[model samples]
Target: MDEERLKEILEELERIIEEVKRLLEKDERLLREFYRRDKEEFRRVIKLDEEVMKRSEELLKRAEELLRELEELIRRIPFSEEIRRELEEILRRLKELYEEAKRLMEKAKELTKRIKKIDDEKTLREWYEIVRELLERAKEIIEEIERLLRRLLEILGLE
Candidate 1:
């Protein structure tokens, strides 16, 4: 080929390469955004989970103390009908709360398994659905814990 024609061909090849480079860079940026959002969202969910766990623990402690007092009273003297009914209700409510907390923990364990299944650098896009689902469940658990906390606080005469 003539010198000028050769130069034109080289320039065309260079332009193609630059275009490819830009496309690759854009893809990299998108991947980074996906990863950043995934991690940040999961972290926020975990913080909320910790808060719920703390409240659950507090409620359990209060329930334990009340149960102990009830046990002591029943052992020392016969309880009136109203007292016995109230005690029974309190025990039943506490049991329900305990079961709910257990379910939350179980859901958390399932979430951890999913996060691990996401593996390393690959398959993040595929895991997006599962990650979102887990976060939603975590939020639900925290909300339930809060409701139970309010009930326990009222029972304990706490403001």
Candidate 2:
């Protein structure tokens, strides 16, 4: 994508993140309002979560493409061919992290769909389990991304 398209994609990703947060907040409110099971409302939450997962995957793909372009730009910096390949490998690994994060997000969204009648304490506990598991998976991806960022900056002497 062009620079403008890239920036627009970034904004879209940010919007998706915000929308997920909003949906979670709304779900929480709905749960509070209904002290008992609301199967239909839970299903609605599942649908919203599905949208989040879809957008998250799209954003991840776009990020990978942009990172590849950035890597190509860096490679054109008159470095040795071997060094360029090395740096390109690093960028490829970063792309893998993004892809893995998307997978984790999809898994989390699927779990959300299975969560029914979360009004009960037992059901809430299960929901928490799903959320925590998803967070942990996502954290793994984030940590890898952070490490890659630091390494790339250092390679570029941007520190």
**Model number with the top lDDT:** 2
Cα lDDT tens digits, model 1, 1-159, are 233432343334334334433433443344345567556665554455455445544544554454455345444545567655664565466456445645655665565456654425456555555545544554454345445434433443333
lDDT of 2 by residue, 1-159 (tens): 233443443344345445544544554445445544456666665566566567656656766666766755665567678767777887789777777776777677666656642446687666766675676666566656666666765665454
Every candidate's lDDT = 0.48, 0.61
Residue 33 accuracy (lDDT) in model 2 = 50
- List candidate 2 segments past 4 Å from native: 1-58, 116-119
Q: Which ten residues in a row have the lowest lDDT in candidate 2?
A: 1-10
Work out candidate 2's RMSD over C-alphas. 5.6
Candidate 1: regions farther than 4 A off? 1-77, 120-159
Taking all chains together, each candidate's TM-score versus the true structure is 0.38, 0.60
lDDT, residue 13, model 1:
31
